[PDB]
Symmetry: D2
Subunit: 217 residues, 4 copies
């Protein structure tokens, strides 16, 4: 399961431990099936705020996102992150350039395409300066500081279903920046595919945002 996001971004599922029944077994503390009874229990748990059983469902995602999105993402502390660094992995340099349609709606004094062109221009210049600095023996740790906040980074994120639901409450919401809403929608889609019963109960009883009640998946 890999979903493209923005112009060069993605969310890819690496691994998953458990499913809806993992929360049911944890609640009962039994490693021991009755679909209607198990679904009823998931709804009951969610309705009455017994959220600890959902901590026993765990996901690992591989996310490629711009730094300004990652910085918001990394504010979610009840999770594990490893970000790409030059020490273990080859680095590549790509940048998020908003399309004009991202920008029309805002009343601006120049055409939205001219905005896109200006952003692409300054990114091109900053990257050229960086490469020029690296070419000259400036270490990458120093030279990278000129690079803009729309630089893509990648990370692995391991997170349990409860903390994933908190992430959606905050980021799958029209108050959040549009870019991280788009990532949260992808995260929601993957969560729904793997834990459909927990996801549906979440939407019915626990979810505090707007977008996942109006946008399917």
């Amino acid at each position: 399961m890999k979903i493209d996001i923005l112009d060069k971004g993605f969310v890819e599922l690496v691994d998953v431990m458990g499913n809806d029944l993992s929360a049911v077994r944890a609640a009962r503390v039994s490693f021991d099936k009755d679909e209607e009874r198990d679904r009823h229990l998931i709804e009951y748990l969610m309705k009455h705020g017994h959220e600890t059983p959902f901590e026993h469902i765990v996901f690992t995602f591989h996310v490629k996102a711009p730094i300004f999105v990652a910085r918001q993402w990394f504010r979610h502390r009840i999770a594990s992150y490893n970000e790409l660094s030059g020490r273990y992995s080859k680095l590549s340099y790509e940048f998020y350039i908003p399309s004009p349609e991202r920008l029309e709606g805002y009343k601006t004094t120049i055409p939205p395409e001219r905005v896109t062109e200006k952003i692409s221009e300054i990114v091109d210049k900053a990257y050229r300066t960086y490469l020029e600095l690296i070419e000259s023996g400036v270490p990458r740790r120093v030279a990278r500081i000129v690079l803009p906040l729309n630089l893509y980074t990648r990370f692995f994120w391991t997170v349990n279903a409860r903390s994933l639901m908190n992430f959606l409450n905050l980021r799958a919401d029209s108050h959040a920046q549009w870019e991280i809403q788009q990532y949260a929608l992808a995260i929601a889609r993957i969560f729904k595919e793997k834990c459909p019963w927990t996801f549906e109960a979440f939407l019915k009883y626990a979810y505090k945002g707007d977008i996942l009640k109006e946008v399917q998946v």
Copy 2:
């Protein structure tokens, strides 16, 4: 995988996400060479880059006396669900130490009389509990007379980094013997699922004594 502990306890493995290669993939941040990969695991452990190990996760089902569970639940970086009578049925079993457990100390009464005195109190506390319940005292009030050797059960979901910290503290000869025995079983399952990480842990990061002796 299930390991019996104490007289009626156990540690069983419920689920696991990942293996040694999950830490390797996380460090390199890539989803899509045996010896190079082992060398990376060792390199991460010896330099303290421990975050990649967070991407290996276990769920265990543990049955343990309350005094053991109390120490275990101090490990905050993990997830717990403890048996409740609201969702499942309760049983009443108690840990009675064996007479070998007290061989070591120069006790005034034989170790078998110690075992017997403990059994005796458990029987009396349990029968008082039952008498209160039969009288109409709610279970949540009645149960307060029950002893700390009463067995409880719990699910424990924990990542490999936190599990290592747990072994550092509990797989150690200064910890209480009973929790040592649980820590040894935890260690055994960890080793079976993540042999490379386990080995690098012992070599480079483990601070206790018992895992290098048994």
Copy 3:
């Protein structure tokens, strides 16, 4: 900063220290050094819209004496710091929570509540005397102590931020919780209200999920 509230027969919650007050959350939210109508309005705005991170910058330390059955539930709250009494550093005393007869009304028990209290006293006394005899005989405390009942009192220090404290109250200041833990939660609430009145009142108005704090 010092307050102590007696709970149960021999228990208590004592305030050891506090960092900050309501304005600490206002300063955190703005990243500033403000030190009123605007400031209250902001606290209410944060609480209403669930922006709770500013409340993490208010921190309490409590000293709590509670029975083991209460402490076990309490220590389930992971986003906090605990240090529990140890014979390694401090002398140990042996006290137990005996419920009063009034605790056992509503309940239509087949023996009088006074006799329920007395039976609990008896079995506790026998357990403690067994513990003492085992200790007297050379049994280590770590082993002998396993016969002691769940109503044995322990003590601990609890350091916790206001956000986590509000989560605590949501769960424990609730009529579905055991009456004993409710009594401890009410004491925690009491101290929290006294030190952070604006946050506490906004919590009650907008975020508190329980029933007993508004009765």
Copy 4:
């Protein structure tokens, strides 16, 4: 408030503190003579009993470049509130020539300082054009470079502060965050001298705080 200037425009400032060395002593004894108390601190640190140090808490106000803030925010056992724009000002970290001498480079270090400064100016001017044109700040700002300064409040307990110093007060860390860690250390040492000295003797894994005073 102790305010320590770091880099060209940065700082670390102490907003508040709860407790001092005696708060860890109280917590260890669970109970509300200097030499006995100092001895307990050393005993705790030596034998790994670190939970008592969780009862000393600091709140700091930090102004740092984004590339430093992003490393800092990886420390999860802490509370952060960062400037956003609807509860700003625009300064940038420009490395000094002396910062860059010591690497073999093909142009003088002062040229490098010059080229960073020029690209920053261009990115800033573009950002200002976009804002003037009606582009919201939250979109326009994505052209700004990683050396833009931000500000945040950090609340952190002494145990977690010590883990932060283990990782950031070390020569393998980026020099810029080392500078910030030295200032955090100075403030820690002033408020908690016995804990700090004990940390250096028994627990600190880094190098720089053993060579560099404060």
